[PDB]
Design a protein around this ligand. Structure first.
Ligand SMILES: OC[C@H]1O[C@@H](O[C@H]2[C@H](O)[C@@H](O)[C@H](O[C@H]3[C@H](O)[C@@H](O)[C@H](O[C@H]4[C@H](O)[C@@H](O)[C@H](O[C@H]5[C@H](O)[C@@H](O)[C@H](O)O[C@@H]5CO)O[C@@H]4CO)O[C@@H]3CO)O[C@@H]2CO)[C@H](O)[C@@H](O)[C@@H]1O
Ligand code: ZN
Length: 472
């Protein structure tokens, strides 16, 4: 049967199923409703930065259509919705004056979700730093971000936390560090060779450190000021794609483990264990900032659950570890990526070149966190795949590859849960086709098709698959 034996009965009692969007990717009204610009508004409005010079000015216009979209997710039998608050929609300058119209939008959205029995899971940040903070403070290179983010978080807790009980601070800080400060392809476009300036060997580490310190400061504020009354939880969302040793050689096993540590351990060792991974300390040395004992104690245990965005897997080949002149966070890993073993590709690619369809990577990642980190509460906060541009409406709707994707990946997640992994929920990226960053509207991740000419929603086969799977 097309469900492959999956249903709510196949997952733990009270297991949460949801869909996910982010503010800039779906809201629209980017320069309206009092919203100030983010670093992504400036970036996307610069010719050449995004596919087709597209931007999020309108996106899916969820800002006007949110009741349609909430009705849809309820009709598809989801329990929860992960979305983000745009910092610059609340504080157009990132600090100071509150945009009451922006506050009203999120109140209306939260209230409608609750009215319809959908639990809000709310990210405070999803790549969309207020442009004013980038210009005034230098964004995530500045340790002052911990104060600025904490004050923003405090406002959100105060304003929405009587209703919102499930928060995340950040979304995929690794990707901000990597694309914004190593490769320099995402805002602020910093890197060693970059026009904007930068240093690919140092800045990614500074940025990650400031995300960890800012997360910890915001959670300390929640716990000391809001938790007693509100009795909610705050976590963080981290991307983790799987790394599998190419062979059982000591060298290849070491490489796959180094990759895991530089990818997920970079954040999870501080959050769970109060230190960076040993291998990062050993290889990155003076370029890796040091937590003081007090900071480490603030960071350790500061996530009530770990959000994991899981998409793909790679084979890793090793090499003898060498003394080398530092060049980048990426090069520091001293690994070699491989996408075939014994002449066979690890899996077929979705539209995005990086996204190999490898359902056993889901098991790999979840089992690994279970075994390495004392089985922390994990929520799969994003998982999905994309179709390419230029298909017909009907071609988008007949998304049989995505149906197969969800059935296979969820079977692998179930395998890990059945083996004892402490996974509390699962969220599909994305509810809607949306603005896919550098790919603009040329990458379609939704279980619901969005016609970007008319803005009409049409559920795809995968949406109906979820509806059938999730029926109560
Ligand atoms: O995107 C959908 C949705 O999901 C969330 O976040 C996504 C995010 O949007 C993506 O940008 C991001 O993509 C990264 C991949 O996950 C990751 O595997 C990939 O890793 C690269 C690595 O950075 C690079 O060094 C390496 O290059 C080597 C080549 O492979 C070799 O051929 C060559 O010889 O050597 C070079 C250098 O060693 O390749 C690897 C493998 O691709 O980096 C991607 C960044 O482009 O994934 C996120 C989740 O994983 C997000 O929540 C939503 O907002 C978003 O819309
Ligand atoms: Zn509109």
């Amino acid at each position: 049967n097309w469900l492959g034996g999956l249903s709510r009965a196949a997952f733990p009692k009270r297991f949460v199923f949801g869909t996910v969007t982010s503010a800039y990717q779906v809201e629209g009204m980017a320069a309206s409703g009092g919203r100030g610009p983010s670093i992504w508004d400036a970036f996307a409005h610069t010719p050449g930065n995004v596919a087709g010079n597209q931007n999020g000015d309108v996106a899916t216009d969820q800002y006007h259509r949110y009741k349609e979209d909430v009705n849809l997710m309820k009709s598809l039998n989801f329990d929860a919705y992960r979305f983000s608050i745009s910092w610059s929609r609340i504080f157009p300058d990132g600090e100071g004056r509150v945009n009451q119209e922006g506050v009203a939008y999120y109140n209306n959205l939260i209230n409608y979700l609750l009215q319809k029995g959908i639990t809000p899971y709310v990210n405070l940040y999803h790549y969309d730093l207020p442009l004013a903070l980038e210009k005034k403070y230098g964004g995530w290179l500045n340790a002052k971000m911990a104060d600025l983010f904490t004050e923003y978080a405090d406002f959100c807790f105060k304003t929405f936390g009587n209703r919102v009980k499930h928060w995340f601070t950040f979304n995929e800080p690794r990707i901000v560090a990597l694309l914004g400060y190593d490769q320099g392809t995402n805002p602020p476009k910093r890197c060693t060779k970059c026009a904007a300036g930068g240093n690919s060997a140092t800045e990614p580490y500074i940025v990650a450190h400031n995300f960890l310190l800012s997360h910890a400061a915001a959670v300390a504020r929640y716990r000391t000021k809001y938790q007693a009354a509100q009795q909610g939880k705050v976590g963080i969302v981290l991307d983790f794609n799987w790394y599998e040793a190419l062979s059982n050689s000591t060298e290849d096993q070491a490489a796959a483990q180094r990759a895991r540590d530089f990818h997920i351990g970079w954040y999870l060792d501080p959050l769970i264990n109060g230190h960076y991974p040993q291998i990062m300390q050993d290889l990155v040395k003076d370029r890796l900032p040091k937590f003081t004992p007090e900071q480490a104690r603030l960071v350790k245990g500061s996530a009530d659950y770990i959000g994991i965005n899981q998409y793909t897997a790679s084979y890793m080949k090793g090499q003898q570890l060498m003394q080398q002149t530092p060049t980048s966070y990426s090069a520091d890993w001293q690994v070699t990526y491989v996408f075939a073993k014994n002449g066979k590709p690890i899996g077929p690619q979705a539209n995005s070149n990086w996204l190999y369809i490898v359902p056993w990577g889901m098991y790999g990642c979840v089992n690994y966190i279970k075994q390495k980190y004392g089985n922390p509460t994990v929520v799969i906060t994003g998982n999905g795949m994309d179709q390419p541009a230029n298909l017909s409406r009907d071609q988008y709707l007949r998304d049989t590859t995505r149906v197969h994707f969800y059935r296979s990946y969820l079977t692998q997640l179930k395998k890990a849960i059945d083996e004892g992994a402490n996974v509390a929920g699962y969220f599909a990226w994305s509810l809607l086709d949306n603005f896919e960053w550098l790919s603009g509207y040329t990458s379609k991740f939704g279980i619901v098709y969005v016609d970007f000419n008319t803005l009409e929603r049409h559920p795809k086969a995968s949406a109906y698959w979820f509806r059938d799977m999730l029926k109560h």
